[PDB]
């Protein structure tokens, strides 16, 4: 009675462009739940964009960014980590499809 779809994908963009997605997230003490697995998730993904072509979609919760677990990480810190990778982003995500 709770189905979670997971996958790890690699994104590679060009200097000029972006990965093509809007990250929304964040209280303090977060306790993951099946319906609410992580703090940051994909509010929107530009169709046909880097992120989109790699297989990322709206509602995707970010579990790991470039190998680092971000389930309980703050928005700013996660954004920064994504920035850090430059033109590549390896991300593990989950889609709660219950």
């Amino acid at each position: 009675d709770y189905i979670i779809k997971e996958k790890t994908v690699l994104l590679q963009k060009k200097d000029s462009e972006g990965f093509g997605f809007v990250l929304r997230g964040a209280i303090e003490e977060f306790t993951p739940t099946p319906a609410f697995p992580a703090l940051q998730y994909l509010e929107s993904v530009d169709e046909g964009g880097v992120a989109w072509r790699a297989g990322l979609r709206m509602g995707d919760f970010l579990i790991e960014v470039n190998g680092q677990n971000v389930v309980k990480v703050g928005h700013r810190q996660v954004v920064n980590m994504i920035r850090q990778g430059g033109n590549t982003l390896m991300v593990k995500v989950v889609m709660v499809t219950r």
Partner: peptide, 6 residues
């Protein structure tokens, strides 16, 4: 919350 485009 807070959103951000990347």
């Amino acid at each position: 919350e807070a959103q951000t485009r990347l």
